[PDB]
Design a protein around this ligand. Sequence first.
Ligand SMILES: [Zn+2]
Length: 54
Amino acid sequence: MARKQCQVCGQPATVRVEANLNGRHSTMLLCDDHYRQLVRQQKRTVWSHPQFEK
Ligand SMILES: [Zn+2]
């Protein structure tokens, strides 16, 4: 129950983000673009792309 929307914008959140805080399951709802932007803030872990590689 308790329908929540994107906490940033009033659009339907297609992504459910479950964050653990001291065991507490925090359910944060964001749109896809927001979530991608959020993960983007965390930098990129293991990503390789040819820059001058052939
Ligand atoms: Zn949104």
